[PDB]
Amino acid sequence: QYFEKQQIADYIDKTFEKKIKEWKTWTFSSVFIIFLPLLLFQMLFLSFMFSPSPKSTSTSMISVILRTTGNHIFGIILYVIGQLILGASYHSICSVYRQVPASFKEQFTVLSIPHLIFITLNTLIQPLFLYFFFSIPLNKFSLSSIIEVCYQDFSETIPVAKCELEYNLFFYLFVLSCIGLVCSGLFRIYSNQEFVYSFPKANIPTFIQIKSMLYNNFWISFYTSFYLFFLGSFLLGILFLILFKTFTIQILIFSIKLWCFTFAIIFQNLTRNRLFEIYFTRGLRFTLETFNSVTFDSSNSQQQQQQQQQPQQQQQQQQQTLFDNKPIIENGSIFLLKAIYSCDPLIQALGWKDFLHLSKYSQPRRTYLYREMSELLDQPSILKIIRQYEDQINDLSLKLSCPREYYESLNSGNGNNIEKIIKKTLNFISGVKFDYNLYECEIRQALSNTQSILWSIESIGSLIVSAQINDDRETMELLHRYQIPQKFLIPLFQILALIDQLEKDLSHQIELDKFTINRDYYFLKSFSNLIEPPLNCLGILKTSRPHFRIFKLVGKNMISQVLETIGHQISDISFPYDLRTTLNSYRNGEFSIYQ
Amino acid sequence: MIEEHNCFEEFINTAAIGEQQVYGEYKSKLDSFTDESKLPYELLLERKNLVELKISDEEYKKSESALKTPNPTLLQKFQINFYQTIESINQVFKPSSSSSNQSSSSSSSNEDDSLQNKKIKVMSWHPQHRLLAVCNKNDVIYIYYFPNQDMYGMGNVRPLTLWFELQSKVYDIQWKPFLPYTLAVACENGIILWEIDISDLKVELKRTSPNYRINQSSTCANILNYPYFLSNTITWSSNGLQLACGSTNHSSILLWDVVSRVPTFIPRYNGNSLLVWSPKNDYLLSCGGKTCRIFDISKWDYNNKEWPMLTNYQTGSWNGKGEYLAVASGDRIQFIQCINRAFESGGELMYVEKTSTYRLQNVGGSGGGSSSSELFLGGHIKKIAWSPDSQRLAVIFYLNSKSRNNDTYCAIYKIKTYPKFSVTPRGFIRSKDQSIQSVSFVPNYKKGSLLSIAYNDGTIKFFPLLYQYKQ
Secondary structure, eight states: OOOOHHHHHHHHHHHHHHHHHHHHHHHHHHHHHHHHHHHHHHHHHHHHHTSOOOOSSOOOHHHHHHHHHTTTHHHHHHHHHHHHHHHHHHHTTOBSSOOOOSSTTHHHHSOOHHHHHHHHHHHHHHHHHHHHHHHSSSSOOOOOSEEEEEEEETTSSSOEEEEEEEEOHHHHHHHHHHHHHHHHHHHHHHHTTTTBOOOOSSOOOHHHHHHHHHHHHHHHHHHHHHHHHHHHHHHHHHHHHHHTSOOOTHHHHHHHHHHHHHHHHHHHHHHHHHHHHHHHSSOOOOSHHHHHOOOOTTOTTOGGGGGGGHHHHHHHHHHHHHHTTOOOOOOTTHHHHHHHTOSSHHHHHHHHHHHHHHHHHOHHHHHHHHHHHHTTOSSOHHHHHHHHHHHHHHHHHTTTSSOHHHHHHHTTOOOTHHHHHHHHHHHHHHTSOOOOOHHHHHHHHHHTTTHHHHHHHHHHHHHHHHHHTTTOSHHHHHHHHTTHHHHHHHHHHHHHHHHHHHHHHTGGGOOOOTTTSOOTTHHHHHHTTOOOOSGGGSOSOSSSHHHHHHHHHHHHHHHHHHHHHHTTTOOGGGSOHHHHHHHHHHHHTOOOSOO | OOOOBOHHHHGGGGSOOTTOBBOOBBTTBOOOBSOGGGSOHHHHHHHHHSOOEEOOOOOOOOOSSSOOOOOOOHHHHHHHHHHHHHHHHHHHHSOOOOGGGGGGTSHHHHHHHHHHTSSEEEEEEOSSSOEEEEEETTSOEEEEEOOOTTOTTGGGOOOEEEOOTTOOSOOEEEEOSSSSOEEEEEETTEEEEEEOOSTTTOTTTTTTSGGGGTOOOOOEEEEOOOTTOOOSEEEEOTTSSEEEEEOSSSSEEEEEETTTTEEEEEEOTTOOSEEEEOTTSSEEEEEETTEEEEEETTTTBOTTOOEEOSSSOOEEEEOTTSSEEEEEOSSEEEEEEOSSGGGTTTOEEEEEEEOOEEEOOOOOOSOTTSOOOOOEEEOSEEEEEEOTTSSEEEEEEOOOTTOTTTTSOEEEEEEEOSSSOEEEEEEEEBOTTOOEEEEEEOSSOSSEEEEEEEETTSEEEEEEEEOOOOO
16 A cells, blocks of 8 residues: 555654663663672672681582571562662663752752652662671671670679660661661762763773773772771760770671671662663664664574675565565654654753764765755755754753843742751862852753753764765765755854853853862872762763853864865855854864853 | 885985985985085975974973962872872782893883983974974973965964973873864873963964953863873874873773863773874774774774784874874884775785885995995884875884984885875985984975974974976
């Protein structure tokens, strides 16, 4: 039959979100397929390291492990279920879109229901993990806050067992260290935004990424567990010199177990969370192959011989798609276009991250999109992807050209002592003014999300340049005929002028404060080995200015890369008069990063 | 198989003897002269334009307010000494290398010292615009701007003089290919990025910039340090947004996002002794110990292919389209076609030229009292450079144990890449017993290729290679 132009669209919708939902659920599964073996190795290692040493019967290492774990199987199942639940409630708070708070109120009042579910599940499950680890060794722990101490009173001629009532030292140590685990884990996630996914800046294969992540998580867990452990044991040890005037060596032997258990819990949470980041920030590919394919993972051997029979294979494939009741899809680009036009910021960031793989490294996908313009089709997908970039420069511009006086009049038309204590204590502990301007916060809210726009800027310039580099002419005269160099440079000049303006306007608000000379506590940071891999490829940056450099150094580079390849074919006639001066500054190289 | 070519051995009979010099390539030759009054007019005119650049041996004498590091606290000096204690423990837990080979492992430490002790360390051109950055003995960098497309008038050009407290022991320097102006400088403190303004290079625009009333510059020294990675070599991406960094002591490439200032680590056993990115393409040369690799940057693999090398040193250059790669180590230059079908096979070998330690017999005419100086040439290669036009390769040597003048000569080859690949020597550039530190071509020269040569005495000199184009 025909299919209608709308039935073909409907088939492409019911294929596109299906393949995305299958990808989202497969990718979620792949994290646990890697995390559960790593967990089992750690639980086996801890079940060995905190077994008492066996007597000299030749019982194998495996038969000792099966006899410690065999008594604990239900607790191991509960522990794995808790690690699955804290993976699901972590994934339920993950984003690509960032939110900046304009004040210390929103950092707690904007926490939507999944964040409150994540907080409550951590507050309940991280103490239960610590209790299970204290339940593995044959030294019985107790959660009684009191113990009966039966000492033998040799003042009588029958030595009476005399039972007097001590407070359980190890219960108060356990409660204080449960609070230490929950508060440090939650503070880090909401202060560093370890739910906004950091996309890797290079296509390094996931086995090397995971090898790096496990090494970085090892040291970061080692020093964070060490500081919680030594600060807790030192403050609590001073309490024993005050109250009991005696230092019982059993405290040290409990403390050395406590550190190994807080270390394990911190490493397990960091390894779970950063495996989601690696697996969801992995570049997808949007082609007719990846969407129309059936996963038939078995026939690999027969590819070699078929090259010489092309037209009869095309006729047989047409007879096959009729038997499949599939429409043909002549537009090989449609699934990349639907990724770019996606109302899911993870799918759009992956769409632009595939348009960036097309534009630099995928010549046959480029030559397809180039010919999509010489086939004189009603609206070619290059111009449709340029529109979602024109749209996204306007969608950013209208949130930067918003006057300061709107925000400062909003501050004119809208507890207390505890909050002023908390702020003054946080500024002291953190090396941050938790003292805010709304205008500088929402310029940061706009700019700190721009990683889609930085990749569309990289990609359209890379695609234009990846016509001229082939010794090609057809694509170059098509690019000029559709005014594609102009449409890449006009909005990019205009929003760069706005950002060479707003860096000056906010410069007068940026005191070189003699403490913003950021000694970012190098004592604690380098007495730890917390040589942090620098926060998440834009964390919460402490000012607007580093975001202005991040936009300008992409834009001013991609302009130079187009003009130093094609800027002698572009006539200034094809620009607005206001941009003819701007075009010549950029053509002559007469520009820098900072005015 | 591909054979060992000695095409260098035929043309040794062109190497200017005694008080002769060779002043440039002319009508596809490198003929020799004692005197510049006897040059062809076409080359004499170019040599009246091409001013010799004498660099200063000076120290940048520290002023009062220069941005001194916040003198590391008693606890940061404890942290440095404590990490040096942990690393000296890790140098005991590193398996001790076979010191039986000291006689071929004391060279590189003295190659490093020889770099730091010279008047000129490193010189680096921008690949499109005529900017020459040069590092002196004292880690002062002089940047020369050259507006004139034929270099007329240059006799009073004052260089932009870049120095900073952490600019100490410079090892390597590369410009960012695309603008705005950015210079990467590898040092003992990591890497400096000078992010540079136009008004410190065009003094004319320093009348029209609004900062003129304040006289201040926006030229700023940013820093890409990762702790305990010493950058011994650096190269920028084919799109200007990333920097690939190499160390002789670390088994990794350190690859930076220069926009968001984030480091990434790519595993490289035997370390990095050389890095070179393809000037238009997603391909990186990495040499380390006695292997070279060519990486596909779309995947960060090298198809398991390791290219073998003769010495622990390597030098290399792509051509101006980045289709081909030259790599030299020992008596030899390997020429690889990277861009073909061959990239699935990790690039293919096309040619092997062989600079052995060959000999002249000086053809003694009847002046029967003159010293019969046995000249020897070629041997171990010190640097190669390919021209932007892809038609020339410039090659300099180390001192062979037969010849005192073996680094006073630059060997020039002509290359053709289509319809078949070939190399043909042309002769030897020499000035009168000045020994060479480094070589580079100059960007966007019309009349053929323009070669710049840096000498151990503090001079950079120019040698036009005038191409006989046809009408």
